[PDB]
Design an enzyme around this catalytic site. Structure first.
Site: not given
Ligand SMILES: Nc1cc(=O)[nH]c(=O)n1[C@@H]1O[C@H](COP(=O)(O)O)[C@@H](O)[C@H]1O
Ligand SMILES: Nc1cc(=O)[nH]c(=O)n1[C@@H]1O[C@H](COP(=O)(O)O)[C@@H](O)[C@H]1O
Lengths: 216, 214
Positions: B62, B64
């Site tokens: 991840d 991004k």
């Molecule tokens: N990649 C992401 C895109 C996004 O829009 N939101 C998000 O939370 N994430 C990632 O998903 C995970 C959500 O984790 P949690 O909110 O369940 O702890 C984290 O690693 C965020 O960085």
């Protein structure tokens, strides 16, 4: 603001330790500020920041284009500053809460955020450009003092400088390989970022000296 | 991709010992772990190979990815060399930046996931207004894997509409950020869950509970 020697920041995007260290060492008489990004960090580890400090005593800007939700942004900034980065580059596109999370860690840890508004590549025209003036204004409202904008679009770089004011610090990539001109960029930016024109040169020291001569 | 129990663990603990222990505790329930910069920048890219060795799980990086095309290609190379099966890439920097990632993924037998709309409140400021167009850009480019927000099920539904039932869609924001697991799975193929599992007293029970609800 950071006092960048010769207004020239090396973008060290070589991906092995030996070459990155050699080239940086070769240009050390001309440049006291090195931007290290994910190409080098994902190849060699965050301990590359430590090695650069030890070898060169150059400031380090971590070009990580931080672009996550606020909680993950905080963690990324904490890990980056733990490693010894002076500053980190953060995207504005994900919005104010994400930028604020970065600013809060930087304030806590005594370091600096640089806000990337508009990017230098052609695809930036698709979505980023239309938001960039508002991203920059958001930065000013949040108290951001350091900004990144594109060498490749002088008219946009000029507008970014207007929005942030003369007191803010502005650095600009896209010089050389992407087509931006050093002198023209320095009409608006405090410092230029240069990668491939220096690190791919047969003689990086001569390449750096040449750019510097051309902006005297 | 076939995600066990439609559940992807977001392993954002920043200490190798905790990350390996917690992942071990939930391993019977998953086969896909999302590893991000919090863990990688704290412990190194070698953590990916370690997860493969210990758990034989699929790894989604991840990261991004949100740079210029040339730097994007370098980031994807480094990431895939480390053993990631897939990488998450932002669409907002535009088509050339996405294309650069797609090219590398094709070379190394991996997958790009295109992040269109993000899950946090700030996504409303700039990303949301571009998100449908970013999704159509993914379609044009031949992207088959997408990420959209659990916290806005109408936006997630729209993303599914744009990409069609054949594309693969994963969604974060379940639990801690307020998204519901069952509702999210009306539209997404799999949910991403971080804090609701890894910050739980009993992570295995947290995962088992989630799977029981879905
Ligand atoms: N990649 C992401 C895109 C996004 O829009 N939101 C998000 O939370 N994430 C990632 O998903 C995970 C959500 O984790 P949690 O909110 O369940 O702890 C984290 O690693 C965020 O960085
Ligand atoms: N951070 C950046 C924002 C940006 O808009 N353009 C850009 O090129 N960069 C980075 O600057 C450097 C430009 O290097 P070069 O084109 O001089 O090689 C690379 O590290 C890019 O990732």
């Amino acid at each position: 603001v950071m006092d960048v020697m010769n207004r020239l920041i090396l973008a060290m995007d070589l991906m092995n330790r030996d070459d990155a260290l050699r080239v940086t060492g070769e240009v050390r008489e001309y440049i006291d500020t090195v931007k290290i990004g994910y190409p080098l960090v994902l190849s060699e580890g965050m301990d590359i920041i430590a090695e650069f400090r030890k070898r060169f005593g150059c400031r380090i800007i971590a070009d990580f284009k931080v672009a996550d939700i606020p909680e993950t942004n905080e963690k990324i900034c904490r890990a980056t500053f733990k490693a010894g980065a002076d500053a980190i580059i953060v995207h504005g596109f994900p919005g104010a809460d994400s930028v604020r999370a970065c600013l809060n860690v930087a304030e806590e840890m005594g370091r600096e955020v640089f806000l990337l508004t508009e990017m230098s590549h052609p695809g930036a025209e698709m979505f980023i450009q239309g938001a960039a003036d508002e991203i920059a204004r958001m930065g000013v409202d949040l108290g951001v003092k350091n900004y990144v904008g594109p060498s490749t679009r002088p008219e946009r770089l000029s507008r970014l400088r207007e929005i942030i004011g003369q007191d803010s610090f502005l650095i600009s990539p896209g010089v050389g390989a992407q087509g931006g001109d050093p002198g023209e960029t320095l009409r608006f930016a405090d410092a230029i970022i240069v990668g491939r024109s220096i690190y791919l040169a047969d003689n990086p020291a001569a390449a750096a000296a040449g750019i510097i001569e051309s902006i005297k």
